[PDB]
Design a protein around this ligand. Structure first.
Ligand SMILES: CCCCC[C@H](CC(=O)NO)C(=O)N[C@H](C(=O)N1CCC[C@H]1CO)C(C)C
Ligand SMILES: [Zn+2]
Ligand SMILES: [Zn+2]
Ligand SMILES: [Zn+2]
Ligand SMILES: [Zn+2]
Ligand SMILES: [Zn+2]
Ligand SMILES: [Zn+2]
Ligand SMILES: [Zn+2]
Ligand SMILES: [Zn+2]
Length: 203
């Protein structure tokens, strides 16, 4: 099955493992994982995080032909499970100094969900792109500004976490994938750049 291919020890996830727009798995509601995790589900989560790290690394991205990403959901690898990985980098300063924390968020999350959110909405000013979508899609992807999430880690431990900013946006995006929702679903149908008053536009 797809999972067996992906969890082979020597296998590195690349773009040929990522399904594309139009594949039905992208529109399913992903199934909840049960704890204790199987070996395969644990391995998949590790390989997903590995892909993001690769994707972000100039060398490996180039070796393996990867488009850079900051999150990945199991449904995008044809696996209908509630497993996402997020890897959101902090940026260097103007003098070239690395940030204090390499990442503002770095997590493999099992059964994640949004449990509360702000009334305020937000969108990234540059829009959103997707590894499964090979088309230009303009417009503001309107999300919750702030979210509280719950999720499990690979050991079964429950986390509850409030997010904001870019971190908020990224997790929302991944969560949507495990519910069958695509980013463009949240772009206004008649003017992609419409702004309802109070929308937090993020730079
Ligand atoms: C920001 C919402 C989360 C994006 C996650 C996606 C990758 C994906 O398809 N996840 O399921 C990505 O990294 N996309 C990038 C993306 O949209 N980025 C990366 C930097 C900020 C933002 C565009 O403004 C690229 C591929 C376009
Ligand atoms: Zn592969
Ligand atoms: Zn392990
Ligand atoms: Zn590596
Ligand atoms: Zn609500
Ligand atoms: Zn996506
Ligand atoms: Zn919501
Ligand atoms: Zn709760
Ligand atoms: Zn539309």
């Amino acid at each position: 099955a797809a999972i067996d291919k992906l969890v082979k020890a020597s296998h590195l996830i690349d773009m040929n493992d990522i399904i594309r727009e139009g594949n039905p798995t992208l529109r399913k509601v992903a199934e909840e994982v049960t704890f204790p995790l199987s070996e395969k589900e644990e391995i998949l989560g590790e390989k997903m995080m590995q892909f993001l790290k690769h994707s972000q690394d100039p060398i490996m991205a180039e070796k393996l032909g990867l488009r850079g990403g900051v999150g990945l959901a199991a449904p995008q690898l044809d696996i209908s499970k509630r497993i996402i990985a997020v890897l959101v980098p902090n940026v260097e300063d103007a003098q070239g100094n690395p940030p204090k924390e390499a990442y503002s968020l770095q997590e493999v999350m099992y059964n994640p969900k949004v449990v509360s959110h702000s009334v305020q909405d937000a969108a990234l000013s540059d829009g959103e792109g997707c590894l499964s979508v090979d088309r230009e899609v303009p417009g503001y992807v309107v999300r919750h500004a702030r979210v509280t999430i719950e999720y499990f880690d690979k050991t079964g431990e429950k986390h509850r976490l409030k997010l904001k900013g870019y971190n908020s946006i990224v997790v929302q995006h991944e969560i949507d994938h495990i519910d069958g929702i695509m980013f463009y679903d949240r772009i206004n149908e008649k003017n992609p750049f419409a702004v309802k008053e109070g929308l937090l536009i993020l730079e």
